[PDB]
Amino acid sequence: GLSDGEWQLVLNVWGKVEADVAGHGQEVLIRLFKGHPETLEKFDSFKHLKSEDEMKASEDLKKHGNTVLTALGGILKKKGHHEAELTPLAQSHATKHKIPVKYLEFISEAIIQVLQSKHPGDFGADAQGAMSKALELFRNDMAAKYKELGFQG
Ligand code: HEM
């Protein structure tokens, strides 16, 4: 875990995302698709997008962006007590979506890149380090759920 002080820095930076969830959501997915093109192959719905301008115009890529960050905000707010919010996500992603754990790592980096690009003034050394342990915790718990569902990539 994170210390009480580290969860506080995490919740505080999250207050910035919550002031514009779909806009931050939309940039996280463009960063991911631009950055690791191969993750795009998992979305039937989006494989047609051939460029950043097309991804930027997609009202559906923006609604999916919103859904991902709304679901991640619900986990973060539990501060580590997220079993229940997490199980269902580990079940769909392992079994239905078939998302390997390095892909969870690539989205973690897109989230940090977005926070840094849009809130540099608020996203200092300290907030950067808490945010990154908070996302490694999420990944590590998801990978553990994977293993007991008996899968794993
Ligand atoms: C921060 C990590 C993530 C969160 C919180 C998250 C959350 C969600 C949620 C809430 C849904 C809708 C319900 C469901 O099927 O469970 C969803 C669907 C989906 N997710 Fe994720 N996700 C994450 C990472 C990823 C990654 C890394 C990929 C693949 C590169 C991915 C692929 C998918 C697909 C293919 C679907 C179905 C989307 C569709 O309707 O076509 N997810 N995700």
Side-chain angles (χ1 to χ4, degrees), residues 6-71:
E6 280 159 341
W7 278 122
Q8 200 43 59
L9 275 185
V10 167
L11 295 183
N12 224 80
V13 18
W14 197 261
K16 288 350 232 199
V17 172
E18 293 192 288
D20 176 18
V21 179
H24 288 75
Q26 183 199 235
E27 316 222 16
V28 160
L29 290 171
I30 293 182
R31 286 227 59 180
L32 174 67
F33 292 155
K34 250 48 295 274
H36 313 261
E38 73 265 18
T39 59
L40 182 72
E41 291 327 288
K42 334 253 4 168
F43 296 79
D44 281 351
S45 26
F46 300 133
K47 51 178 32 174
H48 272 298
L49 307 175
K50 26 281 324 248
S51 68
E52 207 159 306
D53 296 288
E54 282 185 23
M55 288 172 182
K56 233 93 129 262
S58 182
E59 81 174 36
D60 290 342
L61 188 153
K62 181 187 226 20
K63 292 183 196 310
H64 192 64
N66 190 254
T67 297
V68 169
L69 298 192
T70 289

Side-chain angles (χ1 to χ4, degrees), residues 2 4 7-8 11 74-82 137:
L2 276 76
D4 291 354
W7 278 122
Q8 200 43 59
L11 295 183
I75 289 177
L76 291 186
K77 292 184 180 164
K78 325 267 49 195
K79 271 136 145 196
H81 293 141
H82 51 226
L137 171 58

